[PDB]
Amino acid sequence: PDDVNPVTKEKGGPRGPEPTRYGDWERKGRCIDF
Amino acid sequence: QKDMIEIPLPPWQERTDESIETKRARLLYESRKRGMLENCILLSLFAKEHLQHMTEKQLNLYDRLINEPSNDWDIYYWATEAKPAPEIFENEVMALLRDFAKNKNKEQRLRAPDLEYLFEKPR
Amino acid sequence: AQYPVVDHEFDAVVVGAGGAGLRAAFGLSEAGFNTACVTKLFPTRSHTVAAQGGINAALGNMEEDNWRWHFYDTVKGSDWLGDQDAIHYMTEQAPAAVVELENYGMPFSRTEDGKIYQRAFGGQSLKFGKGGQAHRCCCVADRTGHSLLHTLYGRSLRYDTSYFVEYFALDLLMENGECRGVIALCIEDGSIHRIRAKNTVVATGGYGRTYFSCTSAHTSTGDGTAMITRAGLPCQDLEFVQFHPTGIYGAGCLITEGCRGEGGILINSQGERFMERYAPVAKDLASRDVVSRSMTLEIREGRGCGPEKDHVYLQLHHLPPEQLATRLPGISETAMIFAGVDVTKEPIPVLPTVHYNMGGIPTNYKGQVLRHVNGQDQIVPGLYACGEAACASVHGANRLGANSLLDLVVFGRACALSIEESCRPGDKVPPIKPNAGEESVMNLDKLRFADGSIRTSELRLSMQKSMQNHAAVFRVGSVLQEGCGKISKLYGDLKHLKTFDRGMVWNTDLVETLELQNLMLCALQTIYGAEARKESRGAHAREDYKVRIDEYDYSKPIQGQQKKPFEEHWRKHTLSYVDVGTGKVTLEYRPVIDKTLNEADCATVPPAI
Ligand SMILES: Cc1cc2nc3c(=O)[nH]c(=O)nc-3n(C[C@H](O)[C@H](O)[C@H](O)COP(=O)(O)OP(=O)(O)OC[C@H]3O[C@@H](n4cnc5c(N)ncnc54)[C@H](O)[C@@H]3O)c2cc1C
Ligand SMILES: [Cl-]
Ligand SMILES: [K+]
């Protein structure tokens, strides 16, 4: 639960909203990769 | 952070073999040359404001703050309020860096400073 | 002054301690080679640490996959400037590479059933583009790059890798066409170290800081690229530079296209939503390079924003703040930290920003550095390159997202394997002449005492602005030619440099001036290569030459076409050279490798349109 995404059950993955939800890879509004 | 627990790196050591001028010069390099632009900008600007004016005690606290953590992102998140710093980093220099990062006067922090501030007087 | 010179002997020396260099150094040391790793940074400060995203491998954990489909995506993304033998090698190795990294201790995120979790990314597809989205992108929490560095650095120490930390490599030690090591500066104390080795691996990263706006750390100064140039060796495809349209002005921090997906719009100095005039349907969600070119036209015609009218605005403040806070958590904070902007009432200043250097030191798929002699490829004995500094070329004219951590580990390992297969630990290390490296020290001394009329800061900014204004996304003959003149003029200005710090203990002034020399060599080759290439391919697109110029017209059946001779098409790699003394740039070309490693295993993908 601590490190398990409640929706996808991914463990140990990115925190907060899905980083690829817009097609790039974002954190805090920053584009990390595309 | 499993890799970081099962694979510990050589520990950071406070240095006692450096003059204050040498320590300031090293921390200048190590502030400007970070692994992502965010800390290159914030730490190069913070260093410009402080290194040449800090006490040796302050320099050693700053040294630990920016050089002990393996991950630049941990420093960036401690400074921008996304994470709380370990107790070892809870001191006046961390307080200065956290307040600085908040940018309460809405300044532009878009570039590392040119080095002339070290050498020429502003005319 | 006098320069204390210290000699060392190793089996192998790796210049760079990012993902590529660490993988090569760890690989060599694990194989028994007495290995040095020279790095101007503590290893986890390498730009690899900035990678919070992922790494592609066709593990097939979320659906049935095939690494050959990853091969296909990468070839297509490269716009058939990619060398298919290297792309074959990289995509076939990626599944094992990622599982090996997990075994080394990288805690890749996991599915509920224990497999490495994978995301769709980079436009990757199943069934050779016919079967929908592939899920290949693997990650470690929000710190894949850091985890890679920490794991490989830590593991390398268990095998006694020798690190030269905060040492600045100045040049290769070449003798009679072979690399015999590197000469480097100890930044802490000013001593000069000649590190002799039978094999040298250059893994020094990119050269983004040639431009005014880039996503790179301020360490990305093309130093290994420049060492290659100073050896009279070619660089390759340096004009192929990948940009994102909306980086914060000056800082280069990329703002996600999600801001525009939520309704953010680009505005010029007249308050106009100008993308409606360039992309009437897609508007602010047009393709990257369309947006970047549109912004540039606005700026060129005098509708740029700010006191220098040199950027545009990303406007979010017409959006409900609840929407920004809920859908784009963190954008307000990021904009405040760097631009001092409150996104609920002020726009973000933005401009097109360099993110990746597809070009670099040409290699084969084994990581061996290539020269081009009598129109033939030929390996340079004792010399290897890998990572973003290299051009293998797995990315060709356009890198796919999450392939740029993959090429580090694949080709870092390939360099080590190639050395392991051709050499043994303890082989005789070739000697060097007693004055070897003298010219590097002479150059260092000239910069240390430079007392001319142009400060490092001034020349650097002029280079960066000139590259931003002439060699960025918007490319057309007259502007490229103007830029070529400007960069050549600035190269001549290196002879007029002014520095201030005359000491040799932690002389950052001197280091950043060496970095500027290196950047300028990279800039020259980038802009002259771009001016010469009269076509559009991947990230290089010209307003006067909008078509990809291949050996056939691949928009039409090939049966009955006459093939264009090599000299009359552009599906070929640019090779660039600089006469360091005069600044003269020379360009040559070498073929793209279309053959794979084994046609039965992985068929060549013919160019398509
Ligand atoms: C902000 C950002 C985010 C990214 N995110 C992703 C992502 O999520 N996924 C992905 O696939 N790709 C990503 N990329 C691309 C990828 O991270 C880089 O291409 C890759 O990390 C480069 O690794 P490298 O080992 O080639 O070089 P670097 O990591 O840049 O390391 C270069 C090394 O060379 C050394 N060096 C340089 N010059 C000298 C010198 N003169 N003397 C001695 N040593 C020297 C440096 O000290 C350093 O150790 C990202 C890139 C950036 C800029
Ligand atoms: Cl459109
Ligand atoms: K490259």
Numbering used by the authors:
A (entry chain C): 75 to 108
B (entry chain B): 44 to 166
C (entry chain A): 53 to 661
Study text:
Respiratory complex II (CII; succinate dehydrogenase, SDH) connects the Krebs cycle with oxidative phosphorylation, making it a master regulator of cell metabolism. Although data are limited, the synthesis of a number of findings suggests that CII activity is regulated at the level of assembly in some biological situations. This may be a relatively complex process as mature CII contains four protein subunits (SDHA, SDHB, SDHC, and SDHD) and houses five permanently-associated cofactors (covalent FAD, [2Fe-2S], [4Fe-4S], and [3Fe-4S] clusters, and integral-membrane b heme). In eukaryotes, CII biogenesis involves at least four SDH assembly factors (SDHAFs). SDHA maturation requires FAD, dicarboxylate, SDHAF2, and SDHAF4.
As a result, mixing SDHA-AF2 with SDHAF4 at 4 °C slows SDHAF2 displacement and results in the capture of an SDHA-AF2-AF4 intermediate. We purified the metastable species that formed from a mixture of SDHA-AF2 and SDHAF4 at 4 °C, crystallized the species, and determined the structure by X-ray crystallography. This identified an SDHA-AF2-AF4 assembly intermediate. Here, SDHAF2 and SDHAF4 bind adjacent to each other on the surface of SDHA. Despite adjacent binding, each of these assembly factors interacts with SDHA, but not with each other. As relates to the control of maturation, the most striking aspect of the SDHA-AF2-AF4 structure is the decrease in the intrinsic disorder of both assembly factors. In the SDHA-AF2-AF4 structure, both the N- and C-termini of SDHAF2 strongly interact with SDHA, but the additional ordering does not involve a significant increase in secondary structure. However, when in complex with SDHA, the C-terminal 34 residues of SDHAF4 are associated with clear electron density. The ordered region of the protein, comprising SDHAF475-108, has little secondary structure and contains only two short β-strands. Extensive interactions between SDHAF4 and SDHA involve strongly conserved residues from both proteins and hinge upon intimate contacts between the two C-terminal residues of SDHAF4 (SDHAF4D107 and SDHAF4F108) and the active site SDHAH407 and SDHAR451 of SDHA.
